Amino acid sequence: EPLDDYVNTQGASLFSVTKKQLGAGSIEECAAKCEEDEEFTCRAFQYHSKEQQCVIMAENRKSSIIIRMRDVVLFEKKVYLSECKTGNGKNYRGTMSKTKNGITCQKWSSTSPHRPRFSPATHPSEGLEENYCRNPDNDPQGPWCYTTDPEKRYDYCDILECEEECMHCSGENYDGKISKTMSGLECQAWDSQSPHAHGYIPSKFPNKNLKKNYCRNPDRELRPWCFTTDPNKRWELCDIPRCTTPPPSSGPTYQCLKGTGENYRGNVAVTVSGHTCQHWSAQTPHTHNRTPENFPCKNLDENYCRNPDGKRAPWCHTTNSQVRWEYCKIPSCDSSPVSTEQLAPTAPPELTPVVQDCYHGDGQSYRGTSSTTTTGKKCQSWSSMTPHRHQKTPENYPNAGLTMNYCRNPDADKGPWCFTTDPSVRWEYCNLKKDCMFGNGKGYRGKRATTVTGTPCQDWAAQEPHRHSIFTPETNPRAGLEKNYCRNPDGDVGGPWCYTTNPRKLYDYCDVPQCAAPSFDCGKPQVEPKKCPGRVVGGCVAHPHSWPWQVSLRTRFGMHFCGGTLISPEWVLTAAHCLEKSPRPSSYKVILGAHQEVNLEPHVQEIEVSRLFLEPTRKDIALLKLSSPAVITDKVIPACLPSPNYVVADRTECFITGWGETQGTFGAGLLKEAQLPVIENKVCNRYEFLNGRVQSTELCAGHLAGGTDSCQGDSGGPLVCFEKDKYILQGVTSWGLGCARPNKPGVYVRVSRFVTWIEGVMRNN
DSSP, X not given: OTTTTOOOOOOXXXXXXXXXXXXXXXXXXGGGTTTTOSSOOOSSEEOOGGGSEEEXXXXXXXXSOEEOOTTOOOBOOGGGGOOOOOTTOSSOBOOOOOOTTOOOSOOTTOOOSSSOOOOTTSSSSSOOOTTOOBOOSSOTTOSOOOOSOOSOOOOSSSSOOOOTTSOOTTSOOOOOOOOOBTTSOOBOOSBSSSSSSXXXXXXXXXXXXXXXXXXXXXXXXXXXXXXXXXXXXXXXXXXXXXXXXXXXXXXXXXXXXXXXXXXXXXXXXOOSSOSOOOOGGGGSSSOOSSOGGGSTTSOOBTTBOOOOSSSSSOOOOOSSOSOTTOOOOOOSSOOOOOOOOOOOOOOOOOSTTTTOSOOXXXXXXXXXXXXXXXXXXXXXXXXXXXXXXXXOOGGGSTTTTOOTTOOOOOSSTTSSOOEEEETTEEEOOOTTOOXXXXXXXXXXXXXXXXXXXXXXXXXXXXXXXXXXXXXXXXXXXXXXXXXXXXOOTTOOTTOOEESOSSOSSSOEEOSSOOOOOTTTSSSOOSSOOOOOOOOSSSOSOOOSSSSXXXXXXXXXXXXXXXXXXXXXXXXXXXXXXTSSSOXXXXXXXXXXXXXXXXXXXXXXXXXXXXXXXXXXXXXXXXXXXXXXOOOOBTTBOOOOOOOSSOOOOOSSEEEEEEOOOOSSSSSSOBOEEEEEEOOOTTSTTSTTTTSSOSOTTSOOOOOSSOOOSSOTTTTTSOOEEOOTTSOEESSXXXXXXXXXOTTOOOOEEOSGGGHHHHTTSOSOO
């Protein structure tokens, strides 16, 4: 199959020895454009995917120094990662770190130990690089290394033996082939809209490796697992033949102080706390969670003790119990750690609401990612975090050429860019720089075709000038992408542009401006918005209506406890957890536009939802449809189509609009906010924490480290999809009460389960 040698964690490239450059637009086309040349089997490759420009580097991290950006990808085919062979040799590209007897980096092309068997040029495509391990001479033994010590070579210690169905070395090698279970039942597809309305096809975050249904165990359970086809068993332990080896050697170790702290040679253990601790002859008879036989020979000097994980010191036991997480504190020149890595957001709106007159045209193409602006001010010194707040720093990616005060290419989107130190623009240029649209394509039921080049583009089904195998319009057909009509697949916040009739460049815009849809569009900030990092409970801020997509859901007198969402001139979604108990007549209440509790003002929509509602089954998905049509206004925005058959994104953040209580100032008044991601598929439904206490067909949100759901008042708001570049909809925000309950969010309500009335009544009212 054309896919089965790719596994990468991304964001890198290099200042390589020699370099090469081509183009392509699809993934199967690789099998007729990349492998066909003899020049090398690419030890790194660099396909900048969004604009068909493609690159490759003749040498890699095994021989040269690194660079990084967003969308910049040191692709490394599993051949150059092949820490193995089986049988007489086939793909081995070892790099072995540290043996029983202390071998590490020394080279093939060294004439010592014995008359030179290989050097990098001695075959054109088997990679006889520096020290790095190979099966070259038809010599069938496989794992061995050339060394400073002649004594012996071929034996079954550093010959690793990957029985690939479970753990070896770090336990990351979980790319197994089996799928079967302890019960003898079988496991659900991720590959259709039945039996269940969802799938895990490869265009989602790659480190999951979720191919079809084979064993994935990313958090290392004691036995493998996943979702049974049977919705009664639902998910369960996977079951397999036995395991033994594990083929360990001297393995991995750190070269500077990111490390575990195991190597604590010290002749003491001192702290301010006490006197002395445990020589485990003291185990008589209280057994301890660590004892010396599980550290078999590791410098336990009678018993000056030795580190059991965490950081740079011992923290073991004493016959007293004051604090067991007391580490030793010996004064010495040990170490200098700092916080680390990842991400790129906190971006500015570049002053577009009536555009500040310091930008030109639609930026039709600039030789990579760039269609970018020229608003133009002062650059960031990349050896300081400066100036105004943004989520990450140069010392997150330090080896990427980021020494001196080097101006260096950051994260691709603008083209060659620098963090611009000014309120009018937060990024610009790297300091050594040499039938028309609904707007965003999602279900654009139309057929204009313009470029700024004027006339129609190419049809994406066609193979001249641009070409594809997979990405035919028919392959992604849900509202039609046929013929030479306009389609932005980005649906970009920058507006409609397309992979034009113009060959081999970024895009082109229409001849045509965006027709207006504000305050009825899916959920757009039209004045492009301010943003801040969140990850504080309740709310750091209560902004003047830049969250305008607001309905408040209220008692019979009109006191405030819930929220809500318009979805047409009469259609609405809200919560119901004050309802959700008895099928009464008109008096429970809804307000359309109060960003606040009792403190309304008369510009808000204040015709009550006299015609309350609840489903043919009572569920909190209340379409509190308006009696009348709405009285829409700019600080009171509907969502729209609450559709089934869409699916939410994953691991990234969702959001809720929050009419909850304050915590830390005045006791009542105003709406606050929460940003909150997808939870891992092994939390609620599981043996330890709960054993199945909640009905998982409702949709959640929650961090890797705490938050809320929709609190009081937050309830019922637009259940905002962060998809197709600006907010749209899946379900309604459910209930809410009880602020800040640590790491315990709650319900949001799905539409497909009750669709015959939930999407039914809202037809053309």
